[PDB]
Amino acid sequence: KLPKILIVEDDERLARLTQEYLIRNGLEVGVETDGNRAIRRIISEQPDLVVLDVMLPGADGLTVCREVRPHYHQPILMLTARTEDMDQVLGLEMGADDYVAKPVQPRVLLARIRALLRRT
Amino acid sequence: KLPKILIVEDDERLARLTQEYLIRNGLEVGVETDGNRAIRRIISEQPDLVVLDVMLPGADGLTVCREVRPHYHQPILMLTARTEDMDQVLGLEMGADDYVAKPVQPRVLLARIRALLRRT
């Protein structure tokens, strides 16, 4: 009965390294690399939390938020290299509960994931 | 029926400038400058959200957080110059829902406040 995390990240190698670390810290973690696939997968699998990049093939992160939010109310943590002020404000306003700059220290990501899961 | 914000910040001038900005954006905002006073004030006034610095006289931000949490369940956004990885993890683990580095752009702070209020 571990918390289920879905990592949505185009960088396959980065996604996996992040996945392995979170798994080592009491989380069950899956990885999706396509934005359109993420929308379908998030709605059907209903992860406890989504770690979401803004830049994605198929559908970008902002579009992923808009499309899943009517059917998915769990925390979404945006994790991206798109770190300008406008980008951050826009992500949050579109439905992300957090917006984190890459590269993120593993422990910091874990702490933010835990804090979000705490308020559900 | 505006959201009520309490800013807890030792820099009186910075606190006021931040207060004025948030007020201009549909928030009711108060300012507290002492950690010990903040604990009493947060518990009794029950703000909809607290903007909380780590560095405070009387009682530090982590202590304030620790002390109010059994009697205060609303969002706490830590806003501080204490930006080390360990500091961030500790703040979140202590009960903060967000942890933001100073100086923060006004629009970004507003967005984070709204996202946090959204999750109640």
Author numbering:
A (entry chain A), B (entry chain B): 6 to 125
Sentences from the paper on this structure:
BfmR is the response regulator of a two-component signal transduction system (TCS) which propagates the signal from its corresponding sensor histidine kinase BfmS and acts as a transcriptional regulator. The OmpR/PhoB family of response regulators is activated by autophosphorylation of a conserved aspartate residue in the receiver domain (Asp58 in BfmR). Phosphorylation induces an equilibrium shift favoring the active conformation, which includes formation of a 2-fold symmetrical homodimer involving the α4-β5-α5 face of the receiver domain. This homodimeric conformation facilitates the effector domain to bind DNA and modulate transcription.
